[PDB]
Each structure stands twice: as structure tokens, then as C-alpha cells.
Design a protein around this ligand. Structure first.
Ligand SMILES: [Mg+2]
Ligand SMILES: [Mg+2]
Ligand SMILES: [Mg+2]
Ligand SMILES: [Mg+2]
Ligand SMILES: [Mg+2]
Ligand SMILES: [Mg+2]
Ligand SMILES: [Mg+2]
Ligand SMILES: [Mg+2]
Ligand SMILES: [Mg+2]
Ligand SMILES: [Mg+2]
Ligand SMILES: [Mg+2]
Ligand SMILES: [Mg+2]
Ligand SMILES: [Mg+2]
Ligand SMILES: [Zn+2]
Lengths: 211, 175, 38, 142
RNA sequence: UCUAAGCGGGAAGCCUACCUCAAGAUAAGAUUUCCCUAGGACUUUAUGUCCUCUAAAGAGCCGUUCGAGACUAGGACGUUG
RNA sequence: CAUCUCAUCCUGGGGCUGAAGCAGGUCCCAAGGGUAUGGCUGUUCGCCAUUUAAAGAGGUACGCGAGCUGGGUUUAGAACG
RNA sequence: AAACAAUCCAGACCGCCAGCUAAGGCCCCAAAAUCAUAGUUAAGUGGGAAACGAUGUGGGAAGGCAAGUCGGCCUGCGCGGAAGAUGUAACGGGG
């Protein structure tokens, strides 16, 4: 599955001719540049490595400078690989460019991003735990965990127990979203619904794995 | 052990070779094979196969008695094949072989089709009758069971797909 | 099928079988005699 | 006079390759472990690794008797509340033949740092080819 | 006679398949690219020591901060902004 | 807030039926997921009302008070038989 | 004897990098037979359990009927009957 790397630009709506409003997310795609092609003979697997964006040359190390200059491309802000096959590795070469026209209107996709971070959170937010009595004699136990085990059989807390801790800030993939518009002159994709993360964060769009 | 200790009559054209633990037959209908268990000897005269036990134990007689019975069928078939005939009972059920793939209509919401293997062939005299013909007796029985398993015969009106020489239990449903 | 500890013939058309270390009874006259020792 | 211990600096490990095609598993494992520990050498010292290197090839052609190919179970526990995992001998031999020798031989060795250091000298490969052609292994007919 | 030899069908169950983590997997894997090429003595004679010369690729301290955050860690930028 | 077993309540796969169909009875395989809200009483239970595909049976110090409660029981007051 | 006051062998005056045995053992963990001879078992039985069921398989003393076949007793070793709760978990393990 070959796809695109873009930036989440915001969330909008599109009215249709029948009057239905469609909630949409806008994704900006600066056209991706192929920096490397990994094949079975030198790597063990087939993949296309891609860069997008721009970086100032005082923040590009000498190693990354040599890697970017081995191809023709300019240094972007990130590098990412896509697992492919041949008949998908057909005409792809270093110094090539993948644009928004890889997709079409009415296609189903998966979009992966990095969700927003909520910090250190408790059981009520992290695991939908229920709260205890507010005023019927309850002392200091409202959003606390309650019981965490049993009694001397087994004499320990089990692994994978649901407790308080860090929430958010992970890699999350949303499947089954539809392409609503492919604007070629502004280089933008618009998809239907919500996608993980904040505005301005890096997202990856690729054809759906279920089909 | 009466089945072993007896020879099979090999007619002309039929050909048998034993390069290894394999025995293959060649006649007019086709060419077959049979791997042999490691406790059986074979000694043909010219048209007379001889299956004997090695070391003459309880297990070896039992192995030879089937080593005989299956190659007797191999040679019985490569010259004169085998024929099975199934009947469909019940209005609407009908089968007609589209070329090499059999199309059956058996009271369903979708039309059934069966893709035959390479060995067996199948023809169609009328709607409510199928005939399968082959040189491999095992594969022919397998194909017959596989087609029968679609609408196996029921005991209240006898409808379904049956073997011709098959006895069907029958009941009535009063109260 | 009747799953029992004591399986045995019932009529003259009952045959006693041994499949996979299980003793069974099969009857070609009436299928309500099928037995499996278990 | 007294009984001397073998010096680790004077120990000389040798290299051997053993073919596993058509062989009972445990009756091979006992020989492998005896060579890995060094019991066949007159300088054997229970606190010194005076053993030899072994290469096993064709690890997916090893045999079991009876009905064990279908009936011998290998177990694992992930240490989560219900994480017991089960597999066969025959599923594990066509998919990971190195682990069968790993388990069979490591169960027949001591259990401590020197036992961990002895199992390192066993090298198991599924096919007919190994990469250690520079070490010049001998054909050990076990 | 479904089994002894041989060949099959068969479940929300099992293994895959979908998402996330994962080489401290001490067996610590792979690929692309980048950096370092001076002199003298010297004896416990070997990845031996001592004195001048050198200080790279890079990382961090510090600062402006963040849709990242308990402290950390992580992301961006520091005048050619 | 749980975790396990299977002697399985629902859903899945079957044999027999005094199995026409729909729906049942009984037995076998199956532990992946799921498996009500109220009135009364301190109740566990139980009865009733209205739902549900279903409202399983059990082990875990009759799981769980250095996690909460304190209505019952089982201190000191007072009264009835 | 896995671990195991009360079981089995055996009653410790001190020292030895000497030797023979007991109960129990001799494929590896772990010292000593991958020892020799003749059989049985296919169930991992061995390595947990009854009434009862059954052409499993080895041995023995007899019968009926005419290429043998029939079914009856006495026996060695096995099969089913056999479901539980943290994790394989009813050989210490590997095997
Ligand atoms: Mg935040
Ligand atoms: Mg208080
Ligand atoms: Mg409060
Ligand atoms: Mg403990
Ligand atoms: Mg059950
Ligand atoms: Mg109630
Ligand atoms: Mg009220
Ligand atoms: Mg309690
Ligand atoms: Mg009270
Ligand atoms: Mg009082
Ligand atoms: Mg002891
Ligand atoms: Mg020894
Ligand atoms: Mg021997
Ligand atoms: Zn009967």
C-alpha cells in the first residue's frame, strides 16, 4: 500500500446539491519526493522511501545531506517508508514525485496520525470507570480505583490491570473514510469525518486494508 | 485371508511396472498407480498377479489382502471402466451438465454447480438422472458422494438425490 | 446417537464396531440404535 | 601430588557437524549435551567449560516414535492472567526446528551461568547448509 | 465395515488475518549516508606507557517556546531568524 | 474493580426423535464474546411488574473495609412480652 | 524416598584428595550398564479411580460340525467408564 504524507489543516463542511452537510477534514499535501527504493536483493523487502516538506540547511546534518544528495531531491522535514509490491513498484524511481492524483473521488482510505496528548489521567477518563457515591457518607473516595485484586490467592496484582497513567499521544489509524474532493491546483485532499491529531500534525493516507 | 492367496486375471494391453514401491497400470481407459506397503511381495506369471506376505505375520496377510483388492480394481477398470447413476426425486430438481461442469437445481435460492475432477466424466440422458463414468473407482465413489451430499434423500417423501441401488428408509407423519 | 458406558446389540441387525479406540454399534435397519461408548 | 583443575586458558574447543536426518530426538540430545559439557575429555572439570562446538544440520528431519508427532505438547506462559499457549511437535518442527533442539538439549544441561555458556556452542540449522565453513568442522557420526 | 494401509468434508472455538507495541530478541539484527590518516621518546614487550600536536561528524549545556508535559522525555526555532 | 472453571443461559456445529412445516424434547462438541431495570425488605435469597437473543452455575479468606459504606448482628441508655 | 520429626538402610571421639559395601540405583541434569539372554505392552499404559461394557492382543486345558470353521471356559498385559476453578501441574524434569 503506497500512500501520501500530509498535514492536517483543519475541519470543514461541504453542502451537497441535495442539501446534506458533510463534515470534512482538509489535508494539505506538498508533493512527496522519492528518496530511496528498497528491494529484496539489498534489503530483504520492497519499500518506497519518501520525503516531504522543507528544511533549512543549517538543521540538516552532513549524513542526511549526503543521503538527500545521492538522489536529486531536496531535504524535507520528515522521511517515511511505504511497503509495496511490484505492479506497485512499477514506474517509481528516485527523483520521482507522488501527488494527490494517486487518489480518486469516492475511494475508501485509512488515515493514521498521532492523537492529542491528555497527560497523566485517571481511571474515569482512561478506562471509563464509574464513580462512587458523592454524598451518602462517602469519605474521600469519588474517582479512586476501588479494589485491585483478591485476598492472598493469588496474593498479587495481575498484569495488564487498568490503572491511572499517561493518555493520548499515540499512533492511531482510522479506517473506512471516503475521499470527497481531490483539488490538484491547491494540492489538497478532503476526506469525510474526523482524523487523529491536532491541526498541523503529520498524517498518512493510504488505500483501505479491508476493501 | 481368502482374498489374498488368489490371483487376478490381467488381460491384454494392461501393463504393470514396479520401479520402486510404486505399481502403475496402463490399459485403454487410462493410467493409474498404487504405492505398496513395505511387507508385500508381487510376482506375476504373465496375466496372473500374485500378492504374498513377507515374513508371514498377522499384519502382513491383512496388508496383502487389500494390496490385492485394490489393484484388482485398477486392472478391472483400466480396461472396463466403472459406471454410477444418480437420480433426482422431487418436482423442480433438475441437473444438466454444462460442458464439464454439472449444473443442478435442487430447491434452493441459488443454482448449484459442481466442477468435476479430471478423471470422471458425466453425461445426461434426461433431467432427473445423472451418469458418472470413470476408470478410478475410488474417485468415482467420491464424486457420487459429493454430489449426493447437496440434497441427501429425506424420509417423508423420498425427495432428494439418491443412488439408484440405494435403500431409503421411509416414514409417515401422522400425529 | 446414545452415549453410554454399557453399549451392546439390541436387534439382529446391530453390528459392533471399533473406530479409533471407541466401541460403537451401527444398525442398518433403524437408526435409533446407534450407540457410542463414552 | 594432587588433582588439578583444567585452566580455562588452556582449554581447546573443537568444531563438529552432526546430521539429524532420521534420528530419535532424545537419543541424539543426550550425546549432544555430553559433548557440550566435556565429559568425553580426561581434563573434565565440573566448574570449567571444557566442551566442544556442535553444528546440527537438517534439524527439520528429526524423528519421534509412537504418536508423539501429534501428541507431544509444548507450553508457554506470557505471564498475563490467562496466557498459557500450546503447540504441537509437528507444527513446531515445520515452523521453528531450532527451538525443538533448544528445549530438548537445554533441559539436559546444568542451570546457571556455566549452563547458559555451554548452550551457546550449539548451532542448529534447518537445511543442509551452515555458514561456519571457515571454522573447518569435522563430521561427527553420532 | 469411515481404518488397520491410503484419500476427503467439517464450528462464534485454535493458528493466521485487522489495530498497537516490540532487537536489553545479551542470538543485542539490516540498509543509506557522514567523520577521524601528527611527531618524539620508552619498557611490566603489548589493542603497553609517557610528553608536545590535534579536537572531526555529532551530542549536550544555555535561550525563545509548544496543540508535548508532574519532574523528565519529545517537537520547532536561536539574527543567513 | 475483577480473575478463573465448565457440570453451557444466548449465539455457533451436529446425532436421535412418538422430527410434515414453524416450533419443541434429549444427547454430543464448543468457554470467542455477551449475559436487564424497577416495587418490597438490612438482606444474600425470594415474590411481583415490565423488558431481553439471553437474564447460566460455580471457585477465588462464602474475591475485594491499610479501596468506600455501615442498614443487620454483637458494649455502655431506655421500654414491651 | 523430588522437597518430606514418626517410613527404608544405618547409630556421628577427632583427622585423611585411601579401600569394601547397605537401602536405593547405573540415557542426560547427577556418580555408576545406552550390559547380556528370553518374552509381553502400543495404551506415554508405565506416570491416579468402581460396578459394568467390548470380535484388543499373548498363553492353556477341552468340545460341535465337515480349505477349515463355530463359541465356551481358565488366564498375562492393555481399552472405555474418567468433569474445576492463577500456569503445563496425577514420571522432580528433559526426554
Ligand atoms: Mg498536552
Ligand atoms: Mg472521616
Ligand atoms: Mg467529598
Ligand atoms: Mg507465591
Ligand atoms: Mg462440555
Ligand atoms: Mg430484585
Ligand atoms: Mg416510592
Ligand atoms: Mg468475603
Ligand atoms: Mg448498625
Ligand atoms: Mg442496657
Ligand atoms: Mg535429600
Ligand atoms: Mg554419568
Ligand atoms: Mg541393550
Ligand atoms: Zn439394531
Amino acid at each position: 500500500a503506497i500512500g501520501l504524507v500530509g498535514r492536517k489543516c483543519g475541519m470543514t463542511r461541504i453542502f451537497t446539491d441535495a442539501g446534506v452537510s458533510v463534515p470534512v477534514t482538509v489535508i494539505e499535501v506538498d508533493p512527496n519526493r522519492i528518496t530511496q527504493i528498497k528491494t529484496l536483493e539489498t534489503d530483504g523487502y520492497q519499500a518506497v522511501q519518501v520525503t516531504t516538506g522543507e528544511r533549512r540547511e543549517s538543521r540538516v546534518t552532513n549524513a542526511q545531506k549526503g543521503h538527500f544528495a545521492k538522489a536529486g531531491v531536496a531535504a524535507g522535514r520528515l522521511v517515511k517508508e511505504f511497503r509495496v509490491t511490484e505492479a506497485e513498484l512499477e514506474g517509481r524511481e528516485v527523483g520521482g514525485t507522488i501527488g494527490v492524483d494517486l487518489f480518486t473521488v469516492g475511494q475508501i482510505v485509512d488515515v493514521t496520525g498521532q492523537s492529542k496528548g491528555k497527560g497523566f489521567q485517571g481511571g474515569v477518563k482512561r478506562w471509563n470507570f464509574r464513580t462512587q457515591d458523592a454524598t451518602h457518607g462517602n469519605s474521600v473516595s469519588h474517582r479512586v480505583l476501588g479494589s485491585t485484586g483478591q485476598n492472598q490467592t493469588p496474593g498479587r496484582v495481575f498484569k495488564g490491570k487498568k490503572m491511572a497513567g499517561h493518555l493520548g499521544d499515540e499512533r492511531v489509524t482510522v479506517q473506512g473514510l471516503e475521499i470527497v474532493s481531490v483539488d490538484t491546483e491547491r494540492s489538497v485532499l478532503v476526506v469525510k469525518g474526523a482524523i487523529p491529531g491536532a491541526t498541523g500534525g503529520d498524517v498518512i493516507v493510504r488505500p483501505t486494508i479491508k476493501a | 485371508s481368502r482374498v489374498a492367496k488368489a490371483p487376478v486375471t490381467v488381460p491384454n494391453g494392461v501393463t504393470v511396472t514396479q520401479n520402486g514401491r510404486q505399481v502403475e497400470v496402463k490399459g485403454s481407459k487410462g493410467t493409474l498407480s498404487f504405492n505398496l506397503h513395505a511387507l508385500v511381495e508381487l510376482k506375476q506369471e504373465e496375466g496372473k498377479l500374485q500378492l504374498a506376505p513377507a515374513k508371514e505375520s498377522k499384519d502382513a496377510w491383512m496388508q496383502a489382502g487389500t494390496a490385492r483388492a485394490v489393484l484388482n480394481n485398477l486392472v478391472k477398470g483400466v480396461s472396463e471402466g466403472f459406471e454410477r447413476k444418480l437420480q433426482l426425486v422431487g418436482v423442480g430438481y433438475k441437473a444438466a451438465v454444462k460442458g464439464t461442469v454439472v449444473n443442478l437445481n435442487l430447491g434452493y435460492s441459488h443454482p448449484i454447480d459442481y466442477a468435476l475432477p479430471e478423471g470422471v466424466t458425466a453425461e445426461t440422458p434426461t433431467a432427473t438422472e445423472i451418469i458418472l463414468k470413470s476408470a478410478n473407482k475410488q474417485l468415482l465413489g467420491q464424486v457420487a458422494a459429493e454430489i449426493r451430499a447437496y440434497r441427501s434423500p429425506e424420509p417423508y417423501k423420498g425427495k432428494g438425490v439418491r443412488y439408484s441401488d440405494e435403500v431409503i428408509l421411509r416414514k409417515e407423519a401422522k400425529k | 446417537m446414545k452415549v453410554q458406558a454399557s453399549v451392546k446389540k439390541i436387534c439382529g441387525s446391530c453390528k459392533v464396531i471399533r473406530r479409533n479406540g471407541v466401541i460403537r454399534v451401527i444398525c442398518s435397519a433403524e437408526p435409533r440404535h446407534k450407540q457410542r461408548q463414552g | 601430588m594432587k588433582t588439578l583443575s583444567a585452566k580455562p586458558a588452556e582449554v581447546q574447543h573443537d568444531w563438529f557437524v552432526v546430521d539429524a536426518t532420521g534420528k530419535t530426538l532424545g537419543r541424539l540430545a543426550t550425546e549432544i549435551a555430553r559433548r557440550l559439557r566435556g565429559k568425553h575429555k580426561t581434563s573434565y572439570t565440573p566448574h570449567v567449560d571444557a566442551g566442544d562446538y556442535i553444528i546440527v544440520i537438517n534439524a527439520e528431519q528429526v524423528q519421534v516414535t509412537g504418536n508423539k508427532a501429534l501428541d507431544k505438547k509444548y507450553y508457554r506462559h506470557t505471564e498475563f492472567p490467562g496466557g498459557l499457549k500450546e503447540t504441537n511437535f509437528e507444527k513446531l518442527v515445520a515452523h521453528k526446528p531450532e527451538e525443538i533442539f533448544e528445549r530438548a538439549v537445554k533441559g539436559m544441561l546444568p542451570k546457571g551461568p556455566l549452563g547458559y555458556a555451554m548452550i551457546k556452542k550449539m548451532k542448529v540449522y534447518a537445511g543442509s547448509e551452515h555458514p561456519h565453513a571457515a571454522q573447518q568442522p569435522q563430521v561427527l557420526d553420532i
